[PDB]
Amino acid sequence: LPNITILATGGTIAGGGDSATKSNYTVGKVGVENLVNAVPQLKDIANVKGEQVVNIGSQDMNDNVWLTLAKKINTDCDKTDGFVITHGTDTMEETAYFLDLTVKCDKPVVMVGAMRPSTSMSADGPFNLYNAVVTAADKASANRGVLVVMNDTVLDGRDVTMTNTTDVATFKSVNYGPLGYIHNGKIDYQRTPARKHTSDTPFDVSKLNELPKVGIVYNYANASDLPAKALVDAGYDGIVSAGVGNGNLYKSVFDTLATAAKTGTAVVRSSRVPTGATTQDAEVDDAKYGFVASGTLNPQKARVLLQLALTQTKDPQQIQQIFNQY
Amino acid sequence: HLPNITILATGGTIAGGGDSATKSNYTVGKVGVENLVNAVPQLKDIANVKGEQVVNIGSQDMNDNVWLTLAKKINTDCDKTDGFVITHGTDTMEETAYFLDLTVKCDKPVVMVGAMRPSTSMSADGPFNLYNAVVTAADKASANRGVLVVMNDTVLDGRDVTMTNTTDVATFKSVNYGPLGYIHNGKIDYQRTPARKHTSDTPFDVSKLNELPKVGIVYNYANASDLPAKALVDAGYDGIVSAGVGNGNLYKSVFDTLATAAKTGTAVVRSSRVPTGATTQDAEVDDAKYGFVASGTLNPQKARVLLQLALTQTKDPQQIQQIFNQY
Amino acid sequence: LPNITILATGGTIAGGGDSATKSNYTVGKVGVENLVNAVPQLKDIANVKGEQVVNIGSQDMNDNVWLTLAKKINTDCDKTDGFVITHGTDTMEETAYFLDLTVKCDKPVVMVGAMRPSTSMSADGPFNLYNAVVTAADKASANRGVLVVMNDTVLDGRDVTMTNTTDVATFKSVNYGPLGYIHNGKIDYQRTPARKHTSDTPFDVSKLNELPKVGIVYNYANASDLPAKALVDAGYDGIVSAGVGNGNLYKSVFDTLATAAKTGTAVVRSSRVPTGATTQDAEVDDAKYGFVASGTLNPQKARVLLQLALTQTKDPQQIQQIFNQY
Amino acid sequence: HLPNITILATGGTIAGGGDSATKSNYTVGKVGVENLVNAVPQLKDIANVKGEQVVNIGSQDMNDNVWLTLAKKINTDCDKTDGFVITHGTDTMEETAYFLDLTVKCDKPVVMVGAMRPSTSMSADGPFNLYNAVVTAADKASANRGVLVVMNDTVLDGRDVTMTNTTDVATFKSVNYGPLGYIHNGKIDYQRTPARKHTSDTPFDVSKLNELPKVGIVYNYANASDLPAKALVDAGYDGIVSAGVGNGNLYKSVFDTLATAAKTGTAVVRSSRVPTGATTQDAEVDDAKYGFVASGTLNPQKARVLLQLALTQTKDPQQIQQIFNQY
């Protein structure tokens, strides 16, 4: 049996309600030890070692946790055959993409969560954990980048996102589809992500204890410029725009971000629309404003890649080339 | 013997052009309503069409003043026509549609339409979209359904309709509760109507209003700044909508700022950046303890529309939560 | 607390394998009392009684069980406040539509199953059954036709279909959307079906012991006319065509069906395409041939309505009017 | 300095038309490949296009003869051109695409295209679909991805592509594993390629083949007749595909007819009427005991293509299962 390390961070998968009958819950109260021997069947497919990194709801995920995870994985790579990270669902898709760019281990790294409390009727977390361990154990999972395993599906860390606030089936790679499906402890892989990931990216966080400051502003009818201005006034390194339609900006936001970009703030146009690329060549002259188009990266994904691009360059053309390769 | 249909034009890519039929480049102010209407001569087989230019903007620059002008016009002119079609940019068409759905007192058909391809592009979607919009507005079965959006041969209620994709001609969907009807051969089979209260069944009356309460939206993500939320509180915003993570959760620092603002009277609505599903009561956030409101299926930009209108009526969070359960 | 009757028919919800972590299972050997006390929380929301009607896999569902179920619901309507029917997934969409057309009882009738057997890790059956009893107990559920409740969702019996072979979230109302979502035992209903159902249909099976014979033929490139001919030779009352695209037929199948319709066989054009109407006024002049256009009914749903239509009329124009109203 | 691109025309609504732009009615494959081309002058900006008419039929009448003809012509003319577009009806485009995906030995781009609206209708999709199909066939990056379908600005692999909606312009989706890339402003960002073996990586050779093994499809449902199954068996079909219920299950009487056929030599594949997901092994059916093959993600019309070609190599059920695990 392969050795698999579980790195725990908290989440609904470690968290419970007063009741199985009721929807209410508190996040990340169970330790990884307790999580693992609640699924005795993991012992049939791996030798599982648990380590607790942090124990938070993922709605409070942060750069320090990210840097701890990436360095822990890169250091401990030769000690184990694969990793599974137990994590809250709310921001699993951001951590997954961060790790997808910063992990240099080409062994399987699999993230997993639960949409129901571990005390709830028909709790999803047990079988999710089991399938995550199946994926991390499968020799075919290597060299695919950092993965998310939810609802019997293996999803790439770059495309995966949430489709629904509560559904057990919420995690989907909404633009390019999944990599494979898990049935009876076996995976039929038919896809791998063509974007460069893991050991094929320049991003190296081994000596970083903080990341560039990147905030996200929303566009909508009558949008205030005050959020954008607040990030500019604090000296943020970059701003991501959650654009309306194909990455478009409300006029007051457009003005503020055009000004910021002139003074060297990196600006990435993404979209609040859940699927499709924010393209070049549409209504915005990105060349002229010094903006970057996010492509299929949603706002929170574009934040991950922009924070990391800014560790290598402040140059908008070079950042755009980063957004075309990773 | 054909219905009288008014077109209220606001601009949008439907009225927009670039220099090549086969390059994506375009701008939005290009074609007036007269020229828009005359380019689809098949309209005169189904309706007597009159066109009025209300504004001419990209809907990325839609704003409270345009909403108020459109509601008051539709309400004032209800008796002069059999139905209304509004040409509009796609980017914020879902927000305008919900604003009209809550403030229009006319129960004749109001249908919104736009185009995901410019008028000059090969296989331009705007002509057939506008034709189907006029079909919808002329169908007496369209009445009493609220304000509608018609795109890609589908009839969508103004509450649930939203964009699913940045560029796809099929992007407009009612992602939580489905469409009202599909259009085939100029006929509609309706199998649904929205249960939530709309148009003449709301208390929202903008007839005397010249501005709306100030509501901002803040995004949640890992390591989110509280600076956007703090800037809105410092500017005296009447309400703030949180685009939460998962089931409407907030990053700790955002949470701390909004819990403080709610104590001082700021209306706070928790919604979700996740494109489908309710932001529910009775999950991780004790809304009754902080004075917060859960948005239900209303996404952040929709939640903004209803909160602005709620704040014309009340400042009490229990009353705003009741509005969010009924409209 | 309301009185809820569980009419059990078998299915995966009552199905079991040899391991929590192997996909193998069988149906048809586990009784309703086992399901009811796998969900002790039911006692918090209802006074439940279980009756075993049959114990089958729904792949073997048939006209006799349909007739049994409609009669029993219609007969026992006064004895309870609502019904839940436990049922296999595979043909749940057929039974739900039959009962939507034939039940005259004014109380909630809710169907439920499970995509994982009762023995699996993270079995979906217990919370589905709890949510189905919440649904049947909800006064707001009345007057909405026969319902299916799967994965925290209330689906109408006409539109509901399977979208995926294995996904717990497979059940969707793919053309018109769900009626309501369930969270913390509460439903927010925002829709009701416009098509006529239950006590508003002329279908009455109270004394029928069989149903007219209606079979389904599939269309594809180089399709054999031998399936269609085998139904015609056997004197079938009706044939449903799973059409290509918008209800189209391969030349040989069309010829066999145009002939059958001239002898008085009823022919409904439906589509193998899983969403969208088979329309009138496309490539097939239905009036010229004596054919009926299924609208949004998929082939197996079209068979349900065609069987019931033939209990009243053999007339093509009258059958089309039934396909326009139910 | 432009690629040479060959258009092979087969008919389909992308060629012919209704009496009207306003009305839904139409007749299929009445325009020659030549109308098609001249109808899109911008093709000359991106390629040197030459058209040949192979057949001129509605794709609801696609057949084994057209498949053989197409595969042989593409394998013959591979050396003469830089890539192929095939204009085809929508209705069975997904079966011809998998067929060519398994039989074409040319690793130059082969892209299939159609139109969900008649050539004569308002906002016809056929022109820009054809532009995009030519863009795909011209893009050096499209080589070695197997046979493609290009519809609604999306590049789809031949194996997974299928119809999702009877009439929507956006009906074509790779419903299990997603598209290979999206087309904007005439450029494609490929992020995927299919891992299943195709074109020159398959043993299927139709070059000397004037017919295919007989494979029929049977439908399952509540109270399913065994008479369709019995009929194909009586006619000594080489293969039967079951469109099963749920995860490839069969009605008792169909099960028993197909069990009996498999024990005497007939190749039996369980597929599913359910539009997504695999028909798996190790569910309710002991496939090894009955001599059945599980179709995986192949829907019944797709499973028929693969079973016919497998039967040109082998009759052995464990060998057909190996082909169903590999292509």
UniProtKB/Swiss-Prot annotation, chains A, C:
InterPro entries with a match to the protein in the record: AsnASE_II, Asp/glu_Ase-like_sf, Asparaginase/glutaminase-like, Asparaginase/glutaminase_AS1, Asparaginase/glutaminase_AS2, Asparaginase_C, L-asparaginase_C, L-asparaginase_N
Binding site for substrate: 58-59, 89-90
GO terms for cellular component: outer membrane-bounded periplasmic space; periplasmic space; protein-containing complex
Matches recorded under PROSITE patterns: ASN_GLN_ASE_1, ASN_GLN_ASE_2, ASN_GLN_ASE_3
EC number: 3.5.1.1
Subcellular location: Periplasm
MF-aspect GO terms: asparaginase activity; identical protein binding
Pfam family name, one: Asparaginase
Top-level taxonomic group: Bacteria
Induction: By cAMP and anaerobiosis.
Domain Asparaginase/glutaminase: 2-326
Primary site of residence: periplasm
Catalytic activity: L-asparagine + H2O = L-aspartate + NH4(+)
Disulfide bonds: 77-105
Keywords of this entry: Disulfide bond, Hydrolase, Periplasm, Pharmaceutical, Signal
Active site location: 12 (o-isoaspartyl threonine intermediate)
Family: Belongs to the asparaginase 1 family.
Subunit structure: Homotetramer.
Record-given protein name: L-asparaginase 2
Source species: Escherichia coli (strain K12)
Taxonomic lineage of the native organism: Bacteria, Pseudomonadati, Pseudomonadota, Gammaproteobacteria, Enterobacterales
